């Protein structure tokens, strides 16, 4: 369809063996927790996934115990809410998608767990969308609950612009400029959509080193066992 | 199987042991000339279909864009 | 030439050298490879 195509940004993980910047993933998780978690869900990400990536065991335990999670039927036979555990997943904003429709003027905020993977050119798109709430031009008019984001399909995203400069304060203190926040949350969402990005690239580096060792050696063995024929000299000697 | 495959006569066939001969005799010495020899016997049969695929692909893209580009005369 | 006559000519020894080498190769490869990956990122 007719849509603005987000440009290519020089990400720190854009390279072939380039891993993710984990401080940026920590800052983007803070951005999600303070801003994006009010409407969007992360159903396939738990707190224990943050251990060894952005936070330690005790920091992630404190982060999990900051929230409340209904957990099981009491012996008395009823529900109850408990502080989150490292095994708890990220809390739902709404109990069901129809509540999300009712609370967001008919629009459904999608799962942001795989948003980067699910959106064509996601990392860019995300950054662009979050930073692309430009004014609608003449000739186009949008109804309430809509915003002209060139990048968003149709340029009418129900989501209002969620990142105002200094929307939240980074604990690290890095200036919380809108951009610094959009880049951090794009790195984090990326991490979310692929927690193994780093581990894999290490496997790929070992694979390239092993193939660079093994391909000329197997080629040399093949050319040994095929030299015999490749030197064979045929001669026709009719008895004449 | 072997032994009953074919009937040849008076065709002597000499050969050498693998360990007795260089592994890559003149590999880049003649390999390059040969690879180049090869490419010039097949390039005229292979390449021009893919060249006109590239032209048709670009053309389609650009034509499509122009198609999408608003008609200035229209709406005025 | 000595090596061939010692660890590469008898197939049993050929296997021995292979297995033993592989046992250590992993240590070296992993170590070296990791160094590189870390340096890169």
């Amino acid at each position: 369809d007719l849509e603005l195509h987000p440009p290519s940004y020089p990400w720190s993980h854009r390279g072939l063996l380039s891993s993710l910047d984990h401080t940026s993933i920590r800052r983007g998780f803070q951005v999600y927790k303070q801003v994006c978690s009010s409407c969007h869900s992360m159903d396939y990400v738990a707190y224990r996934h943050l251990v060894g990536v952005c936070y330690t065991e005790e920091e992630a335990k404190a982060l999990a115990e900051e929230v409340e999670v209904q957990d099981g039927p009491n012996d008395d036979g009823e529900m109850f809410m408990r502080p989150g555990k490292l095994s708890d997943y990220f809390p739902k904003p709404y109990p069901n998608p129809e509540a999300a429709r009712a609370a967001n003027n008919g629009a459904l905020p999608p799962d942001l767990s795989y948003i980067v993977r699910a959106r064509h050119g996601g990392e860019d798109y995300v950054f662009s969308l979050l930073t692309g709430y430009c004014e609608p031009p003449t000739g186009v008019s949008l109804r309430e609950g809509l915003y002209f984001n060139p990048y968003f399909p149709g340029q009418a995203i129900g989501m209002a612009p969620p990142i105002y400069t200094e929307v939240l304060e980074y604990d690290d203190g890095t200036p919380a400029t809108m951009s610094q926040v959009a880049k951090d949350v794009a790195t984090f969402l990326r991490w979310a959509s692929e927690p193994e990005h780093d581990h894999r690239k290490r496997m790929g580096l070992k694979m390239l080193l092993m193939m660079g060792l093994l391909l000329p050696l197997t080629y040399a063995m093949k050319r040994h066992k095929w030299s015999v024929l490749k030197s064979r000299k045929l001669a026709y000697r009719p008895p004449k | 199987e072997f032994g009953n495959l074919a009937r040849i006569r008076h065709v002597i066939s000499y050969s050498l042991s693998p360990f007795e001969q260089r592994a890559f005799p003149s590999y880049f010495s003649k390999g390059i000339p040969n690879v180049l020899r090869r490419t010039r016997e097949r390039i005229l049969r292979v390449a021009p279909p893919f060249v006109v695929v590239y032209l048709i692909y670009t053309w389609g893209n650009q034509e499509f864009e122009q198609s999408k580009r608003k008609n200035p005369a229209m709406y005025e | 030439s000595r090596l061939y006559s010692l660890l590469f000519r008898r197939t049993s020894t050929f296997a021995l050298t292979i297995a033993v080498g592989a046992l250590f190769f992993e240590r070296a490869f992993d170590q070296g490879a990791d160094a590189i990956y870390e340096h890169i990122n």
Binding site: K233, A235 | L16, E20, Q21, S26 | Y4
Partner: peptide
């Protein structure tokens, strides 16, 4: 007969002596 010709030259193939065989 079988002696009219000699084995063709493999010099461009042959490497450049049991002494060496062990290494080879």
């Amino acid at each position: 007969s079988h002696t009219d010709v000699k084995v063709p030259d493999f010099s461009d193939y042959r490497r450049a002596s049991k002494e060496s065989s062990e290494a080879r």
